Swiss-Prot record:
It comes from Rattus norvegicus. The chain holds residues 243 to 1511 of 1545 of the full protein. Residues 55-352, 643-923 form the ABC transmembrane type-1 domain. This is ATP-binding cassette sub-family C member 9. Belongs to the ABC transporter superfamily. ABCC family. Conjugate transporter (TC 3.A.1.208) subfamily. Subunit of ATP-sensitive potassium channels (KATP). Can form cardiac and smooth muscle-type KATP channels with KCNJ11. KCNJ11 forms the channel pore while ABCC9 is required for activation and regulation. Can form a sulfonylurea-sensitive but ATP-insensitive potassium channel with KCNJ8. The keyword Transferase does not apply.
């Protein structure tokens, strides 16, 4: 694969030269515009003179190539002119003459055509290859500048709080890509008239008069596509917004798989979501319509146009048209039509580039100056003003110099200024107004080169945690491991699948806010030249009974070391030696003292405080013809007249166009001067012109056919997913990550909706047209059948090479763009988190490598495409020479040679289209196959003769269930239980019972979750067989509680999705529970209130589902309250007793006394499962019952 092949030109245009050009251009812009500061409000009027890398070579070569190409058809006309044979009556001598008769000879013209074709193709490809190699550089430059102005300026930002991710939202991939594409496409806009005008002049010169009327039609046909563009863009935007709504709803739905997999809300939660898709589907249909129409515009106008000219042929009154006069005219028409689509694309591209550059100028001209205005002491200020950045009059009359090595902490939660003052001390905040002085020596950035900082708003790297803490220094096990073990991350030690080197942070493994603050303080610890600066890091993530432990680890770490260590915390848990304190209240620090010296000043301040206290052979070797069978699956299944109608229609239209050409040949076949006459002018209008309507009609039908098929398949494919995974087995869902499933649901549905149809249409059109042309060229000369056989056949092998080669390069590209954008994700996301960490300049060091490391692969892919195009062009030129030589040797008639040469010139260009479309289809279908293999697989059957049983909510025998006795080793690949634990429970057991870790999880999962070979045996449960309960409805009757009850969506506003028009959820079944009372009884949100992905965001009064409200099932099952307030848990227990009035039986799973302390009826267990029934807890102590529980009792 050779993912990182070579930089091979990092000096040329990677990082250094890009800045060396763009910065100088900016300097020239500012210096010149200084004279007219506001008379002319330009932005990048000097963006022309930005590089010195000329683009004039591109335009010059392009103009030369266009002239040669447009000349070619005149050579075709010459080669057809000499068809008439005027000999046997005059054979001039013309001895030794050179320029006299060198022109009209056929063979010399043919060789001229070959030379011109090769030269034009080569010049064109080389010129815009060079242009692209410059474009890439421009993109690198623009990015380098956006970073230079976003890194060392965007730290002290206060207006940016309106949109904190605006930069990483705009400049990520919408702007730079737009500018790179527009630079690579500019020559078309600059010199497309150089082709249109030239073609018009040639057509007027050789066509005469009957064609201009039929010629100027296409010059207006192109604006039809330019007009369709806007509507297509609007439809795409609407579809994108609907897709965003669908994606958010799907994320919410899929986030509760284990919760909904058995409750009464399994399928229903997707109902509207399904409609959502259908709803969104409607918008997609609208977009498809315009696209299909656009294809008709591109598939009909030429034919139509030429008919017009031939209609105006009746305005010429001539006998007929010389076959050497109109074949070349049609060739010119078929050549002119190419750059018009480029022009139409440029119509939108210019607007996109202008918008992007203006947005970039506005962003990079937004308070970026003044947001960075430039014994180890820094602070001596006599300011008449020290503004909170933009906010003036914030710190008036501030003057303080802080002796080092102190615990300076102005503890205060209200009006403290701890963040404003903390940022303004080290100069990182714009409080420099007035006069500021520093110490007599540093041992001009305001004396802060020895700073050290830790998070106040948490921050985690998008990489390994160990990387997140490496902090740009050495890394050896001794000091790092000692610091880590001072306050060990044991839960993080076991939870990370590869240690601290495993996934961590955003788009990685999650981390808690307490752990986040610990990580921040630890990365503060593993820093050198420690003169640390903190701004109250321990007011929220308080280490319970460990904040003192953390401060003692830090004691032996730095407070027993020679390094200034401070903290600006407000907590009184670690208040020992909290000597330094201030009373700012919108003022500077005017207080400083020892532990009791503050009481000397005797402020009401001290006293008051007390009162408030895998293999390559299985990937590469099987990569050849990768999607074939999957493509057959794609087309066949969901194709409404996929090939019954659309294939036949496409073939009919193509053959009809070929017959139209043959009819054009027939109309002017041989009657040229055999009959000037008056009745021979309109003979063939029923043989040639009468078919013209077919050319404008038949294709139009096919213009929708392919697209229509795709639309149907999309809905069906999407529906299949919902059909497949409406409900599923718990093993896979508890095994695989959620992100991959969400990606398979979203990205692949986008691909199948948007990109497959145009690729298929283009590939089919190219293949069929090339085949038709090959057939014609073989007809006109038998030798052509042999003559066109070998070389292209060899090309076939070469074709196969590309059919893989660039794909792998694309594969490299497919990953190459992942990291670099994340860089622009990180530095900006921490707009202030990386303010003054003494490594700001060092941020460029990695970016300037990444940019080149990616643009190198970009250029490699471009070069591969260029080589493919050149090879196709030369193969076509060879085919043209062969067919032309054969036609001129055979010399049957002018019509045959004209048709052959025109079709060869047509086929010259379609090979690149065919190859590119083949690659696109292969890659797209391979992407489809990733989720098309799991299209409808079913792994949870339901085949039971369970008779109709009423089974109301009544409790038969208090839910007596003892069905496990010496449980066997479980199976069915669903996290089996791998031991033996006989089960024998207490029927009338109200309160919960302590349990061992060995079987606590197994029992918790065993309350309702299915299993085959787990604990089968003698059973007495529920009055119906455990295995014979109906799979249609019985599983809907169960109930569970999540480990830490999280209901992300509303689940209250629309909680009456099943048949409950109870009209009592307001205050009768919920307020009495006293946990839902806060959100219901005394709340104005109402019976229709929702919280976005929150089970604990806005619902703190009842994190668990309201048990009484659901009983406005009958079996209640508990879990492990990981983050529940003990008082609230006791209140919920009182509500549980209120429910027990209707239940009087509850089983729970717990291993700690905090959840198993209130036992009223319990059992005496065996190794983790209940062994016998016994109320007394002391009896359980004598036996093996509660010894592990006794470890706290
Ligand atoms: C490789 C070299 C192959 C040898 C050349 C064979 C082609 C014949 C010479 C070219 C030629 O002018 O012959 C024409 C027909 O030949 C033919 O038709 C030959 C057909 C191919 C035979 C195999 C006569 O054409 P003309 O000079 O008489 O026409 C104008 C009078 N007004
Ligand atoms: C100058 O050009 C044209 C001239 C005429 C017409 Cl009517 C269309 C174009 C055109 O289409 N565009 C403008 C400029 C342009 C862009 C790409 C190509 S390319 O050779 O097809 N290369 C790729 O597309 N991708 C590679 C792979 C990695 C990404 C970047 C390069 C060729 C040219
Ligand atoms: N991003 C911001 N938006 C609005 N006001 C701000 C911002 N940053 C600072 N301020 C202002 O600066 C003043 C000083 O804030 P201070 O440092 O006391 O907050 P804090 O004590 O860190 O907050 P917390 O107690 O939650 O940690 C506040 O009155 C606040 O209005």
């Amino acid at each position: 694969i050779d993912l990182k092949a070579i930089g091979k030109l990092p000096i040329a245009m990677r990082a250094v030269t890009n800045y060396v050009c763009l910065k100088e251009a900016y300097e020239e812009q500012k210096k010149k515009a200084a004279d007219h500061p506001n008379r002319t409000p330009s932005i990048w009027l000097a963006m022309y003179r930005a590089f010195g890398r000329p683009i004039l070579l591109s335009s010059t070569f392009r103009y030369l190539a266009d002239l040669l190409g447009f000349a070619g058809p005149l050579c075709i006309s010459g080669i057809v002119q000499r068809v008439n044979e005027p000999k046997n009556n005059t054979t001039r001598f013309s001895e030794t003459l050179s320029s006299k008769e060198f022109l009209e000879n056929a063979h010399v013209l043919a060789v001229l055509l070959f030379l011109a074709l090769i030269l034009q193709r080569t010049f064109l490809q080389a010129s815009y290859y060079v242009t692209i190699e410059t474009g890439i550089n421009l993109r690198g430059a623009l990015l380098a500048m956006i970073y230079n102005k976003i890194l060392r300026l965007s730290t002290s930002n206060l207006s940016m709080g309106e949109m904190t991710l605006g930069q990483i939202n705009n400049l990520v991939a919408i702007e730079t890509n737009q500018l790179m594409w527009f630079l690579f496409l500019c020559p078309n806009l600059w010199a497309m008239p150089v082709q249109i005008i030239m073609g018009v002049i040639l057509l007027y010169n050789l066509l005469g008069s009957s064609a201009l009327v039929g010629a100027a039609v296409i010059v207006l046909l192109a604006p039809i596509q330019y007009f369709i563009a806007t509507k297509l863009a609007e439809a795409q935007k609407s579809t994108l917004d609907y897709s965003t709504e669908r994606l958010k709803k799907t994320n919410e739905i899929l986030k509760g798989i284990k919760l909904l997999k058995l409750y009464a809300w399994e399928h229903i939660f997707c109902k509207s979501v399904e409609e959502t898709r259908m709803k969104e589907l409607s918008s997609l249909k609208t977009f498809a319509l315009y696209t299909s129409l656009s294809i008709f515009m591109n598939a009909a106008i030429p034919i139509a146009a030429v008919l017009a000219t031939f209609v105006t042929h009746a305005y010429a009154s001539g006998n007929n048209l010389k076959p050497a006069e109109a074949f070349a005219s049609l060739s010119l028409f078929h050549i002119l039509v190419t750059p018009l689509f480029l022009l139409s694309t440029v119509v939108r591209f210019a607007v996109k580039a202008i918008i992007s550059v203006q947005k970039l100028n506005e962003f990079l001209l937004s308070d970026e100056i003044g947001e960075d205005s430039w014994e180890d002491v820094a602070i001596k200020v006599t300011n008449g003003y020290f503004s909170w950045g933009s906010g003036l009059a914030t710190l008036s009359n501030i003057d303080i110099r802080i002796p080092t090595g102190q615990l300076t902490m102005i503890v205060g939660q209200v009006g403290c200024g701890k963040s404003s003052l903390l940022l303004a001390i080290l100069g990182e905040m714009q409080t420099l107004e007035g006069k500021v002085y520093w110490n007599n020596v540093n041992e001009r950035s305001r004396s802060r080169y020895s700073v050290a900082y830790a998070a106040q708003k948490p921050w985690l790297l998008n990489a390994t945690v160990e990387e997140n803490i490496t902090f740009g220094s050495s890394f050896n096990r001794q000091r790092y491991k000692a610091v880590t073990d001072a306050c060990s991350l044991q839960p993080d030690i076991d939870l990370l699948p590869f240690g601290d080197q495993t996934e961590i942070g955003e788009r990685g493994i999650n981390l808690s806010g307490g752990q986040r603050q610990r990580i921040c303080v630890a990365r503060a610890l593993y820093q050198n030249t420690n003169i640390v600066f903190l701004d109250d890091p321990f007011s929220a993530l308080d280490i319970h009974l460990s904040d003192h432990l953390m401060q003692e680890g830090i004691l032996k770490f730095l407070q027993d070391d020679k390094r200034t260590v401070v903290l600006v915390t407000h907590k009184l848990q670690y208040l020992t030696h909290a000597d330094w304190i201030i009373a700012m209240k919108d003022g500077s620090v005017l207080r400083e003292g020892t532990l009791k010296d503050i009481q000397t000043k005797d402020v009401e301040l001290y006293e008051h405080w007390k009162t408030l206290m895998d293999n390559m052979s299985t990937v590469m070797r099987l990569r050849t013809k990768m999607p074939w069978k999957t493509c057959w699956w794609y087309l066949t299944s969901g194709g409404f007249f996929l090939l019954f109608l659309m294939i036949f229609s496409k073939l009919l239209k193509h053959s009809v166009i070929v017959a139209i050409d043959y009819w054009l040949a027939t109309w002017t076949s041989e009657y040229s001067i055999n009959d000037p006459g008056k009745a021979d002018q309109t003979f063939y209008v029923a043989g040639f012109s009468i078919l013209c309507g077919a050319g404008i009609f038949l294709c139009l039908v096919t213009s929708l056919t392919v697209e229509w098929m795709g639309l149907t398949a999309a809905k069906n494919l999407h529906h299949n997913l919902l059909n497949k995974i409406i409900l599923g087995p718990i093993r896979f869902f508890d095994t695989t990550p959620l992100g991959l499933i969400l990606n398979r649901f979203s990205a692949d549905t986008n691909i199948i909706d948007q990109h497959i149809p145009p690729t298929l249409e283009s590939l089919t059109r190219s293949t069929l047209l090339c085949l038709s042309a090959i057939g014609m060229i073989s007809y006109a000369t038998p030798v052509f059948l042999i003559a066109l056989a070998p070389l292209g056949v060899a090309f076939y092998f070469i074709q196969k090479y590309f059919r893989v080669a660039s794909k792998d390069l694309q594969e490299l590209d497919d990953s190459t763009q992942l990291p670099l954008l994340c860089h622009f994700s990180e530095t900006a996301e921490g707009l202030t988190t990386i303010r003054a960490f003494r490594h700001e300049t060092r941020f460029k060091q990695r970016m300037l490598e990444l940019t080149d490391t990616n643009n190198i692969a970009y250029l490699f892919l471009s070069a591969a495409n260029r080589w493919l195009e050149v090879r196709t062009d030369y193969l076509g030129a060879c085919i043209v020479l062969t067919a032309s030589i054969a036609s001129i040797s055979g010399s049957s008639n002018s019509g045959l040679v004209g048709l052959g040469l025109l079709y060869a010139l047509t086929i010259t260009n379609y090979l690149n289209w065919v190859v590119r479309n083949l690659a696109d289809l292969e890659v797209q279908m391979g992407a489809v196959k990733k989720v098309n293999s799991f299209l409808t697989m079913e792994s949870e059957n339901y085949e039971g003769t369970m008779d109709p049983s009423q089974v109301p909510e009544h409790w038969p025998q208090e839910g007596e269930i003892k069905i496990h006795d010496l449980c066997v080793r479980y199976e069915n690949n669903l996290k089996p239980v791998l031991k033996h634990v006989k089960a024998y429970i207490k029927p009338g057991q109200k309160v919960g019972i302590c349990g061992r870790t060995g079987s606590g999880k197994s029992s918790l999962s065993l309350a309702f979750f299915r299993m085959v070979d787990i604990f089968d045996g003698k059973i007495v449960i529920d009055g119906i067989d455990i295995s014979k309960l109906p799979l249609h409805t019985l599983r809907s009757r169960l109930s569970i509680i999540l480990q830490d009850p999280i209901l992300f969506s509303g689940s209250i506003r629309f909680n009456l999705d099943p048949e409950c028009k109870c009209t009592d959820d307001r205050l009768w079944e919920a307020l009495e529970i006293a946990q839902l009372k806060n959100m219901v009884k005394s709340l104005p949100g109402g019976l229709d209130a929702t919280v976005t992905e929150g089970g604990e965001n806005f619902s703190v009064g009842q994190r668990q589902l309201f048990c009484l409200a659901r009983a406005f099932s009958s079996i209640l099952i508990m879990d492990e309250a990981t983050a529940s307030i003990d008082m609230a848990t006791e209140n919920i227990l009182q509500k549980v007793v209120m429910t027990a009035f209707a239940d009087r039986t509850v089983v729970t799973i717990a291993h700690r006394v905090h959840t198993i302390l209130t036992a009223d009826l319990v059992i005496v267990m065996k190794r983790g499962n209940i062994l016998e029934y016994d109320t007394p807890e002391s009896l359980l102590a004598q036996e093996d019952g509660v010894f592990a529980s006794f470890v706290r009792a």
